[PDB]
Amino acid sequence: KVFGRCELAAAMKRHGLDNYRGYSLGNWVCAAKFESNFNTQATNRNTDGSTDYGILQINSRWWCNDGRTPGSRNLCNIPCSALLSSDITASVNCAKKIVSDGNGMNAWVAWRNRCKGTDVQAWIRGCRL
Numbered sequence: 001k002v003f004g005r006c007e008l009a010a011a012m013k014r015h016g017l018d019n020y021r022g023y024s025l026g027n028w029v030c031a032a033k034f035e036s037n038f039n040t041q042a043t044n045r046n047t048d049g050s051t052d053y054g055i056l057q058i059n060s061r062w063w064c065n066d067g068r069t070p071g072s073r074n075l076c077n078i079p080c081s082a083l084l085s086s087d088i089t090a091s092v093n094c095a096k097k098i099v100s101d102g103n104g105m106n107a108w109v110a111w112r113n114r115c116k117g118t119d120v121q122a123w124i125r126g127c128r129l
């Protein structure tokens with residue numbers, strides 16, 4: 001699909017992301033334009049061999065099943081292809097706890113620099129929520 005700015009962010013407040021688990025609601029909407037550029041069909045493999053999956057930019061190496069990742073943990077226990085479709089209604093149970101493991105957003109790379117030390121509080125702005 002193709003989400004407009006105000007139209008692909010209000011979905012986090014329908015999934016318990018507003019002020020969830022130590023991160024504020026706004027801290028989130030920013031990286032989205034920084035991970036797949038508001039699109040769920042944007043994916044790539046890596047120089048390390050782990051294939052990424054969706055707007056979320058996840059690797060088949062530590063989190064899901066693509067089967068081409070042997071010794072892959074897959075603690076999520078759901079097909080990697082289970083997130084990329086237009087419907088993402090079940091797509092966050094993993095990204096939800098990916099931070100509870102104690103290292104936070106560190107899994108995400110772009111935010112640590114692209115959204116870190118920024119006016120992240122300035123992306124979620126301009127939309128009613």
Ligand SMILES: CC(=O)N[C@@H]1[C@@H](O)[C@H](O[C@@H]2O[C@H](CO)[C@@H](O[C@@H]3O[C@H](CO)[C@@H](O[C@@H]4O[C@H](CO)[C@@H](O)[C@H](O)[C@H]4NC(C)=O)[C@H](O)[C@H]3NC(C)=O)[C@H](O)[C@H]2NC(C)=O)[C@@H](CO)O[C@H]1O
Pocket residue numbers: 035046050051052056057058059060062098101102103104106107108109110
């Ligand atoms: C734009 C782009 O291309 N970015 C891609 C990333 O989105 C993508 O994701 C990140 O992949 C890296 C590896 O390439 C991954 O790094 C490690 O992740 C694990 C598990 O989540 C972390 O877990 C820690 O484990 C240690 C023991 O190993 C524990 O003691 C600690 O308590 C754990 N803490 C956490 C975070 O739970 C590691 O900490 C982390 N590496 C380091 C240096 O600590 C990220 O987690 C990935 N994040 C996401 C969102 O998937 C990557 C994969 O293909 O590709 C990038 O290109």
